[PDB]
């Protein structure tokens, strides 16, 4: 049974809802982003209306073979009028084709569903700035001040100069990095760029890649491993077995890996800059662990919320557990006393 934070009152939707069977009530089911959480349900015998980015709709019909006919793909930043209400689509700074959805209700109640997302000042700047909003179902994540991590700018920034080092010192070094989902592309393409090489990875990898709308993607990845020297690797194998044996299948081109494992936070955020993060070794392997993240930081996503200045918060992450919950109902006060709305 669907829980309450992913209905939308005093409409036929429901929000990242597909694990639930029939929904009683739901007329448009809208998925806000292709991460396994989200779609979770979601198949080719599929047959209710589903409304999302034109990017997720690349993915829904090549990846889970959701019929073409059930696939209602939404422009961003554009006001469009579902099953009689109007919504408007806004980019979530998360994963590729991901969504914020704003729905305004036909009793003028404004209803702001985050997705998951990482805010931005760029945001106080889109259709947001013009009106009130009531209700605001935010992601939650890194809701606590802990979870501090750099800008996307600064990791990436560490690691090109990283793996430049590394391959221009030793032009045998393979580059390998980690993945297990959409997003992130950016670590694997700016490593490429920086080496003059194209990005090597599986076929199943690629046919993802092509659905993202990434501007002169042909001239950027490729499954012909042997013309690379940046690989992606499924992230359970980024380990030193794991490591090991893919550089054994290489026959004798490298003699060394630098290895990427882009986490969300860690706990040695606490404690380490990222200038100055290190690799764990062993003899001809490296493996870094970056913290680049695609969810808001406590600080920014506090910033967002003070500017937005909703209503009610109603969370999405963090939601099973009493200490969780309390912990999160305390800083919502905060905000809302220190900037007064
Ligand atoms: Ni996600």
């Not at 297990?180 to 992130?184: D, V």
């Given at each position: 049974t669907c829980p309450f934070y992913k209905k939308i009152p005093g409409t036929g939707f429901t929000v990242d809802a597909f694990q639930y069977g029939v929904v009683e009530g739901c007329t448009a089911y809208f998925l806000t982003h292709f991460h396994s959480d989200h779609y979770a349900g979601l198949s080719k015998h599929f047959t209710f209306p589903v409304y999302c980015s034109e990017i997720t709709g690349n993915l829904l019909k090549n990846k889970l073979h959701v019929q073409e006919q059930y696939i209602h793909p939404l422009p961003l930043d554009t006001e469009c009028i579902v099953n009689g209400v109007k919504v408007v689509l806004l980019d979530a700074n998360h994963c590729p084709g991901a969504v914020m959805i704003l729905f305004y209700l036909p009793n003028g109640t404004v209803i702001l569903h985050t997705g998951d997302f990482r805010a931005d000042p760029s945001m106080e700047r889109s259709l947001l700035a013009d009106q009130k909003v009531h209700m605001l179902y935010l992601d939650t994540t890194y809701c606590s001040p802990e979870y501090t991590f750099p800008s996307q700018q600064e990791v990436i920034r560490f690691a090109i100069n990283t793996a430049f080092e590394a391959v221009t010192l030793n032009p045998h070094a393979l580059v390998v990095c980690g993945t297990?989902?959409?997003?992130?592309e950016k670590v694997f393409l700016a490593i490429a760029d920086v080496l003059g090489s194209k990005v090597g990875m599986s076929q199943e990898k690629y046919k993802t890649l092509q659905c993202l709308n990434i501007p002169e993607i042909n001239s950027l990845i490729t499954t012909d491993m042997c013309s690379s020297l940046v690989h992606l690797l499924p992230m359970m194998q980024i380990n030193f077995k794991g490591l090991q044996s893919h550089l054994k299948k290489c026959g004798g081109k490298y003699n060394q890996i630098l290895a990427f494992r882009p986490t969300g936070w860690t706990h040695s955020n606490k404690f380490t800059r990222i200038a100055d993060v290190i690799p764990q070794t062993k003899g001809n392997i490296s493996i870094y662990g970056i913290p680049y993240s695609e969810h808001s930081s406590y600080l920014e996503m506090k910033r967002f919320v003070q500017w937005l200045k909703p209503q009610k918060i109603i969370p999405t992450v963090n939601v099973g557990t009493w200490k969780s919950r309390s912990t999160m109902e305390k800083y919502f006060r905060e905000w809302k006393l220190e900037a007064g709305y």
């Open positions: 297990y989902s959409i997003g992130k």
